[PDB]
């Protein structure tokens, strides 16, 4: 797009990852105002309108809140307390033809200052004196649409810095385009709290035996409790099981008869019981009643 015709384009109802922006190693003036660039992918905002121009690299640092200049006065202005990212990188290899890349004209002159976030287009010429121009170009006509000279012999400050503005405004609208959500791997046969794509709960992630039709995402059973789910990256059916729990039965024969105890663990497969009770937290007297030389089922 041009700076006279950077459209306020609506890209909506999709996702755009931003982690691929950092690692490709060509950014020049990648600047995120308001929100941190590290926390851009996980948390988003609404009003994700997008802008684009190949601005010249001499005054990219003039694009700042509370900073005017030439680009911020006659080309494009940030408002104060701006949330969003201005992302500049090198554009020497492709937007630079022989004899000067005269494909992007630019508005050099304007009668007043720009309001921020305004796309400026004009056909008429600048007025500076009292004598009006009669169509034929004269001494005070001052044609604003000059040309950026983008030659391959230009340096890194003279070659264009390709800016894109992922501006984040705040209006009463639903959010459309956000960054990606990071996911961990999946474990099996352990009592784990799980964060799926919409449902969360506590249980044991087990390998399944049934299968679904291709339009169920999850499933429940008698009396409305979730028992099955499918992962969204590999698409395999998975049944869940409730976690280990229950009671400890400890033999006492009465105070006057004896003192020592034996220990029974009801409704538990007792191979994971020092993970179950806090034997590493309690006394060493409690430590010898999570195991022993004799094991009976």
């Amino acid at each position, epitope marked *: 797009a041009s700076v006279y015709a950077w459209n306020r384009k609506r890209i909506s109802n999709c996702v755009a990852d931003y982690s691929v922006l950092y690692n490709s190693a060509s*950014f020049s003036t990648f600047k995120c105002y308001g929100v941190s*660039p590290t926390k851009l992918n996980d948390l988003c905002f609404t009003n994700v309108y997008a802008d684009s121009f190949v601005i010249r690299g001499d005054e990219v*640092r003039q694009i700042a809140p509370g900073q005017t200049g030439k680009i911020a006065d006659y080309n494009y202005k940030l408002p104060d307390d701006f949330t969003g*990212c201005v992302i500049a990188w090198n554009s020497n290899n492709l937007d630079s033809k022989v004899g000067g890349n005269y494909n992007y004209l630019y508005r050099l002159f304007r009668k007043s200052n720009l309001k921020p976030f305004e796309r400026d287009i004009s056909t008429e010429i600048y007025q500076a004196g009292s004598t009006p121009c009669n169509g034929v170009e004269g001494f005070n006509c001052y044609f604003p649409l000059q040309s950026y000279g983008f030659q391959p012999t230009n340096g890194v400050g003279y070659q264009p810095y390709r800016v894109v503005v992922l501006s984040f405004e705040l209006l009463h609208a639903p959010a459309t385009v956000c960054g990606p959500k990071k996911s961990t791997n999946l474990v099996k046969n352990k009592c784990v709290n799980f964060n799926f794509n919409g449902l969360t709960g506590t249980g044991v992630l087990t390998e399944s035996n049934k299968k679904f039709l291709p339009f169920q995402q999850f499933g429940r059973d008698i009396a409305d409790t979730t028992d099955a789910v499918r992962d969204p990256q590999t698409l395999e059916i998975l049944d869940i099981t409730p976690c280990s729990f229950g009671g400890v039965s400890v033999i006492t024969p009465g105070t006057n008869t004896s003192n020592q105890v034996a220990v029974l663990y009801q409704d538990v497969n007792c191979t994971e019981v020092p993970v179950a009770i806090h034997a590493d937290q309690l006394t060493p007297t409690w430590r010898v009643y999570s195991t022993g030389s004799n094991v009976f089922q």
Partner: nanobody
Amino acid sequence: QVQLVESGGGSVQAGGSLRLSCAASGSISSITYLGWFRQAPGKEREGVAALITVNGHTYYADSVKGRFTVSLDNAKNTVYLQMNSLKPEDTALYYCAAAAWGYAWPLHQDDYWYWGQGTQVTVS
């Protein structure tokens, strides 16, 4: 909220090597970009070295290209500037800086930085 302590300076002969260090304390996880500044006598403060903490990507100026090396140690939260094959035109005050709003190349003084105290490096 971000504090930098710079050490490792000193005097060296022409063709020697030095290894500066800049130790950070405070909001470590917000730091996204570390740059090395240099203020020559009779010149403005310029940019020399660059390092992105997220990526490990490095950028170097043309006057230090092929001779200067920047390295990051996240265990000690200390960035390093390995300056090998020194010449007496590099006799200047060297400053380490921290950024938290992103990375910008080349370095400019007018942005928001967390400044160090600076050490003296003399090559003769």
